[PDB]
Amino acid sequence: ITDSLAVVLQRRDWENPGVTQLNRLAAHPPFASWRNSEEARTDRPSQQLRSLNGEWRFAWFPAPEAVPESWLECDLPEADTVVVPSNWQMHGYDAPIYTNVTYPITVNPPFVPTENPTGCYSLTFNVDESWLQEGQTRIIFDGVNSAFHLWCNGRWVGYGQDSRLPSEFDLSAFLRAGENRLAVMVLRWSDGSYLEDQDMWRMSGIFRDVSLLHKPTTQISDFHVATRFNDDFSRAVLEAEVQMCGELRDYLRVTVSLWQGETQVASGTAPFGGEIIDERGGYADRVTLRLNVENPKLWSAEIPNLYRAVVELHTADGTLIEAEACDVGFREVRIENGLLLLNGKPLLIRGVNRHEHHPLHGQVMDEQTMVQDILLMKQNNFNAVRCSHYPNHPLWYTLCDRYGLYVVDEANIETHGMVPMNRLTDDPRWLPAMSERVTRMVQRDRNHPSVIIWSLGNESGHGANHDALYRWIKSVDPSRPVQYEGGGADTTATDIICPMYARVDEDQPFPAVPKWSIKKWLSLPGETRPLILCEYAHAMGNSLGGFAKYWQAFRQYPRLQGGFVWDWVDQSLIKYDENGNPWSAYGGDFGDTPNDRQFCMNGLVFADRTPHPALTEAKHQQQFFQFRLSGQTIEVTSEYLFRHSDNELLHWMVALDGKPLASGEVPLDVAPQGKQLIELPELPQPESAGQLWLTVRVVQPNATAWSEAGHISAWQQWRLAENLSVTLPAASHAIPHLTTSEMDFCIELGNKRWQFNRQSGFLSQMWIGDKKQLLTPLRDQFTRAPLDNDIGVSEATRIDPNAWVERWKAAGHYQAEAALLQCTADTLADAVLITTAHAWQHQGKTLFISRKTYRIDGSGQMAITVDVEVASDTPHPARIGLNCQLAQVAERVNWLGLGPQENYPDRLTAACFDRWDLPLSDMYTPYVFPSENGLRCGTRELNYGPHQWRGDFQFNISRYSQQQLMETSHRHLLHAEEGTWLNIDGFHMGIGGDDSWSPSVSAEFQLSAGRYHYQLVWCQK
Amino acid sequence: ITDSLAVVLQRRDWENPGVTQLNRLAAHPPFASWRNSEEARTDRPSQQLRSLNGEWRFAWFPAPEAVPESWLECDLPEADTVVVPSNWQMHGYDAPIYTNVTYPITVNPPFVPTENPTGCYSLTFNVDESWLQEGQTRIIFDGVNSAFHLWCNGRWVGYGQDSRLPSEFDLSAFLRAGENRLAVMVLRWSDGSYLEDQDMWRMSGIFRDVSLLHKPTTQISDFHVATRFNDDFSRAVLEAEVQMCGELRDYLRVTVSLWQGETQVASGTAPFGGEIIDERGGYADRVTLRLNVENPKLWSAEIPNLYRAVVELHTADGTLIEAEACDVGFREVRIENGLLLLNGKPLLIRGVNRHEHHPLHGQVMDEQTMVQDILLMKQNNFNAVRCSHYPNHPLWYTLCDRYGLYVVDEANIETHGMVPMNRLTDDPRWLPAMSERVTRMVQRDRNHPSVIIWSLGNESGHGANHDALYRWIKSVDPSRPVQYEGGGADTTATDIICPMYARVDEDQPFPAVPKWSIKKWLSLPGETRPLILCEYAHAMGNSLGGFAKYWQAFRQYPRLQGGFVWDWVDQSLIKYDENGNPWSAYGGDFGDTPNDRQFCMNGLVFADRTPHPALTEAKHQQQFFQFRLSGQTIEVTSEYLFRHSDNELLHWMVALDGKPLASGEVPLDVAPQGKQLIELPELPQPESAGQLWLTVRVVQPNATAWSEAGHISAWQQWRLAENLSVTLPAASHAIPHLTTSEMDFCIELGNKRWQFNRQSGFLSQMWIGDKKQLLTPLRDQFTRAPLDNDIGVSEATRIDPNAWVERWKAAGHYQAEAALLQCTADTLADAVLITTAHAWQHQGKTLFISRKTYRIDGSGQMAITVDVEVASDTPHPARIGLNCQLAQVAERVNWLGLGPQENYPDRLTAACFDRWDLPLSDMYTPYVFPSENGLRCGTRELNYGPHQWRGDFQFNISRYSQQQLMETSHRHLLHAEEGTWLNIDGFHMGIGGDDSWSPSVSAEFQLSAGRYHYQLVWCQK
Ligand SMILES: [Mg+2]
């Protein structure tokens, strides 16, 4: 009766911040409870550890108060068969919601809405009778969103909160020999919900593993590891403290052995009971061993050398009661003199923020995904990762320990939607609930060599609870620094200045919480801390413009030590339709209201782990090698702090406009933080006209754990010398034939004809024989299919008059009327000259003036010449070029310029100048939210079909007009047009991306000169 | 049903640190809910605040699971009618328990015994319909020990822990019109018991006030006061921040007024809504006014200047919603450069620890008692009080605010009997619970000028939780230091070094937590804080030995800023004898087990608030006036930091061996910390043989709110001269007659005769006529009826070998046998001379050797001459002197020496050298636990009845033989013996008292000389 839902629900513990648990065990690092040392040593699987993962029965309800009392005893006839772990939203029971800051529920802490999607999980299973004879048997839940009531065999067991840390319960007095049945009742919202407002998809269910662990009554209940070194790391001391539970006896001992593979390096045995700490004594049930290690191998992301520690509990005769263990890695993380050091050297953080997201699985993680993500970040030269914004799946930490990556363990606390942000975190009544999220976090992951910083959570302003919490960690684990960003990023609750989205050189002086220019911040009066951005370079869509700017500051200021790009992957989901054909879904796509539409898309990779183009920019900038060129000498500078360059080959190449003149290979032999000098054999000194370019690559001959042989880690390119062309055009044996009509001008020359509408003023059509070449005339373009950064957070409803898009619209840029001021056509001896002038106007105001001259000669080469005037008072145009719809549709595209990836003016350092040729298909980037894309810069010659253009411009070429782009909300809605659309730009505006909710394109990238000039040559073959 | 006892108790909330309250409302400053601004100004009584103190029905059960369900519905026929507040033990329901360290319950956290004296209180009452029309009705329990469930009209209402702070609940939705009934169920043991292990009587029940408050729906829910000054305090800024609950409407206003008397000093009005705090704006529902005050009058324990602040919640139009209020005192407490400052002057803390105890009422407090203690303290030179060790009665802070005493608020946390002491304090699972104890305290007391220091608790060792809660306070409130003694007194969780019992010059090097000499601490490498003993000078019984030594150091060192004596009032309880007579009881006096005996009495005053002789040693040492005497010039020094000597007259007197030759009076005119010079008119230089002695006193002409007219606040006394007596005793006509026999020596002279037992060697009898003088022979005495300090913790079951008592005992001091070595008579010209030589021995060893000469002259005077040899390898004896039981019983006692009060060698500075005369009665100290007492040192002449002694000695005289004192365990068990007992000490060991569990007698006070000699003259009248 007391176990009846009717009773258990009365109290409504999901509406009490005072009840965050009910009968839950205490936190600790990971246990398996080995019963044999070797197994323990080599990490084999423990029989004392059982997974309860797989097929469970499930049933959804709109409210806890609607679950049938019978559910405790009997399986619902209307129940399903689902797999655990899993997110409910992913099986169609209800919708995932995607809001950013706004809380999915009504803000009435600590209450939650009566209608509260309740999920009833249940499972029947067998228990070995042997597990009933001795020890203790607990159930461990790795993750449950957001809260839950538990039952076994009909009897109420416990209750938990915090979706992101494990929940343990003793079942010992409830199991039965034979068949037992579990019944979990999970809830969507609880008071917990106000502490978990992360900007991500709001799901729910039993998303992490479920296991049973069998322990001996007298057991190891906890253990911490530690490492101390001398002034040079030539000697370390490993210090292990072990705790016990159960009957204390004089014959119990603890043995601690440290292995180096198959080698045993140090061992220590002792009996329980430690130092006298206070007037009352010491701990009888604890012990600290101290192992000396000579010349330890240090762990680091560059070389994640690991050791194995085995902790055995046995009897004086040597009879083993139980075993626990862990990989250990020797490192010292410290802040000295303003710098964040690691093993003695100042780190340079190359990191990224990363959520646990999976397009099909939701919030469920799995090795494969975890590893894929790992290999990628490493291949792209990432050093660290931040657990935005909650503790991760247990195994994540193990993977970072072995692959080598710096982690930032973050507490499951975000209360963004509160006003002010402070509300909860400055309220003592909430201290208890928050404390649990910090403390159980440190209790669980503290022994991982990879965790090197602790974080108090995210965007919960600055409260007093924050200070209490910072002090707690500082006390229980003096070994790692502590960071929190809320409230201004440089509060008493943080060891590091960790702003989010603070610019390189421009201040953003918000009242109370300004973001100073990062260079400025360091020197503020009294400031001594290192600065490491927790979020920067907001990679939403076509972004990561200005990246090179940070890296350049990072490398020049000792106290600027990195940052974490926001973010790893796109939080997009998969959907279908007719043929159950998949499609990437975003905010709103589920009927979810409210929502932040595409704002859940900001990764460097698509949800499927395929790259956005921005990635490459990243890889290039974070490279570990830096090159300088002086004369015929290449200086290589290492940026590794511990390794020698031992899997590295330098490849150099020289070429004339894409034509290779000389190659070479030189093995790298540089010492962490050192230089090498590579001497170049005499270099080719051509006469032919052209650009001489030098290009270097760093190749890894051998494979590694995270890279296959041949991998390319770095590159650099230099322009050697130019040879201008002073060659005269071949004399011709005829000249074009100008022809007038009421309607247009027709110029012919053989089989080629060009036609110029007299009323429009534009080259309206062209022929190669009988074949018409255009579908739309060739006109001036001054706009673009607004980028995400361009739009910011402006909506139909909420209009942000600052977003470039709004400025462009309001200015009429999109609806301006082109007017012909003057067309003229003349025959000269050697050629035919056409001339135009147009003006664009919006409501009586002229924005732009286009003055051109075409010149066709005997060779059949048309020379275009553009001269543009931009009204000084009009919003800087996104672009200054031409565009037209081609009738042809070829397979490949070939150009001589920056490539091969999409590149923009404020994003093209990763781009190398050379001869590229790709499939048309690769010229359109499939961003989930359509906008301008595909651009390539610094182009000198461009070939598509029988055409060919030459000049100095940027271009894009695809089967979709900007219009289409700018009108389709999802890439899957896009349809290919008739021929190919070509945008030829003489000038393009930067894309920016310092952040996606404000203007970020810096001055240098704004088309602001007033007057632009360009010239093209257009010919066939 | 879900209100039923079976359901509520199912969860055993009192056995879970997870749950510490259900449905309890937030903490806050004190509320009244006035509805008329003046009544609030004037602290009238609000009709909105109703008391529920008075008669209540009560029933007692051995366990929670034994109360009948009917109780929820109806009263129990077998129920009684008690007065509330009260401690159930004081009514005989179960016994009170006295333990110090050792918990009164088996240590099994967080479990409590199934046997749990449960007290069911009930009350029936009537609510005015009005209270039900509008607003909210809350109930406030100001103290309930140790936990309790609560029901209203049948319905479960909530629950609470922490016996020392208020618990509020909303009854609003449970009330009816007319009759209403409460059913409060009080528990004895709860998980919260593990955090209340203060050394004191373990009682239980509803011990503080019970009230009902009615507050408007839209109301003032919080408010804090804050004062800032300029450099010289010439200007201050009063910052009041107000918080509101309810419906927020633009027409709401908050007005804050500052009054000083009837005069309005300042005021400020404003709408709600503060400054931006973070990216989400600010508090809509708060506002902060800032009132400028010029030349504000400052608050000190010296001058408790107070201002009244009024808070008005009204509509813009002027309608009033409600008014709250508080007394405000302007003062800044800051630590700077190692010093603790008050309005920029360095404090000198003259204070004491104080528990809230009442002989008749147990733990319940009252205006009277409270006020009494405040006056005693102020009258005896006290400066401040320490809330040992929990928050006090609300009324107590007001009283100190108004009376003038620095308080140290202390959280109700003590885990003393744990092992180690850290045990729960360093465990994150107890963080919430501890947190709730500090935060609510701060929340409620934060506005009392009186409170200048926060303390995190008592003897709980040092755990991480301490560091968290320390920071918390630091952030939340930065206007007061934070101190804590645990784990070393100098940890990271305390702004001040505050040891308990550290000696002045002796280090006590305990492991992990040593107690350095207070002078040495201050200077350890890197140390910089101020030192203030949280607890010193253990006042157990006959104690305070050495107190002067402390005050000389506090005086000498800057950073040595004072301490808190331990303690104020004895923790004794009253019982009754079959003849209706009441007696003081103590540990074990109730059948309680286990108990700590007399360890509950340590106060400087008797449970009835009567003074112990020690209260004078403290009064004099803590005086605020220091005197220096130069020739004939008295140099006065003020120790007040704020006041000028405005009610001070200095009286001076010169006297010869007790005779007054000259007097005087001079007004006192001294600035704080300044000096005054007083020049004494020529003093008589009489010829008369003797000792001239000058004595100064400071008297307070006018009465104070805390002291009557003619108050003596300080006293100055120096030896001016000596006139050695060259006289010879006029010739005598008569001459004693000696009569030898086989067993004696009769000496005769007139009506008097002296008989010396020849086998004893001692003077066996004496006669004045036919009247026999002695009842007991006169013999050499070397022992004392053991003091509390000599006993320590020594017990029968647990002998403490290091104890004085144990040593003396083990050495046979108490059982030595006198062996005659020599007894001889001799005839002289003018008289008769007896020579004896005795030896004390034990098991073969000779401890002492007394060699005497008696010399009866014809003047009728008997001259004694003592010479003692004490083995060097024997424990310095308690005393070296004589004793005998007299047959006479005089009424008074008159003497020439130190007094009036009982004084010992290491405690006599308070005593003045004069001629005292007091009723035999006053020469006995009624220490609840009997032992040696009443002594008076530096005696020159002692008169009792016809007898009269002369020499230089110390003596005590009562009706209790040392043998009985040491034999009786309670003062009410002693019976007067036939005559009068007299002890004439030639030397006496000090009493000590630096602590009562180790040997606290310093070197300079032990009788280690080896050889002693004293001389006496015994004569009649
Ligand atoms: Mg809850």
Ligand SMILES: [Mg+2]
């Ligand atoms: Mg957020």
Ligand SMILES: [Mg+2]
């Ligand atoms: Mg509890």
Ligand SMILES: [Mg+2]
């Ligand atoms: Mg104690």
